[PDB]
Amino acid sequence: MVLSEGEWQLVLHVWAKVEADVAGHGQDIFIRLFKSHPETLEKFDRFKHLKTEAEMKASEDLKKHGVTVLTALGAILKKKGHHEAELKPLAQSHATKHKIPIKYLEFISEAIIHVLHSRHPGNFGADAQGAMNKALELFRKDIAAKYKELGYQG
Numbered sequence: 001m002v003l004s005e006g007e008w009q010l011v012l013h014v015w016a017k018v019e020a021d022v023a024g025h026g027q028d029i030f031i032r033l034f035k036s037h038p039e040t041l042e043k044f045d046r047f048k049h050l051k052t053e054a055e056m057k058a059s060e061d062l063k064k065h066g067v068t069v070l071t072a073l074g075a076i077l078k079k080k081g082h083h084e085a086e087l088k089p090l091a092q093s094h095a096t097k098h099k100i101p102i103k104y105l106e107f108i109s110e111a112i113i114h115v116l117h118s119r120h121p122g123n124f125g126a127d128a129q130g131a132m133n134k135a136l137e138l139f140r141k142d143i144a145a146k147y148k149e150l151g152y153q154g
Ligand code: HEM
Pocket: 040, 041, 043, 044, 045, 046, 068, 069, 070, 072, 073, 089, 090, 093, 094, 098, 100, 104, 105, 108
């Protein structure tokens, strides 16, 4: 699949807003993910002890992790589809070291859309959400293909 320049513009326009507060968006997204799909929390040995949203918000390590994740995702989105090089190491660590099923990538994609919808309604209307979903589907599709080449079905 391929996004048009118009769709990329919608994606990058709302992403520019997210970059005004990467740490904050990172926390909201992971808290949403962990609360909505608690099973994903078990994949993080560093955070699986967190019991409440309050503890999650107060975790300095979780906040730093969120920044690392969103920074990596932002770099991929800014490539506008030409992300082969960026995807290689990400696909290897998540398939081989962390063992993250494609299903879980769908869950975090849902969390990202939910947070952008809540925080940026004016810049995240129907068309913008469709563009973001398409960009994330492309990401998940290419990651899945790499998973297979690497020997991980998940
Ligand atoms: C938007 C998709 C995602 C991106 C861009 C992303 C990115 C990253 C990055 C850059 C790191 C640090 C470097 C590395 O280990 O490769 C990381 C670590 C990790 N990711 Fe992801 N990730 C994504 C989704 C997920 C999901 C859905 C899970 C599982 C629910 C997951 C689990 C992990 C784990 C367990 C680590 C190691 C954390 C640690 O122990 O420090 N990731 N991820």
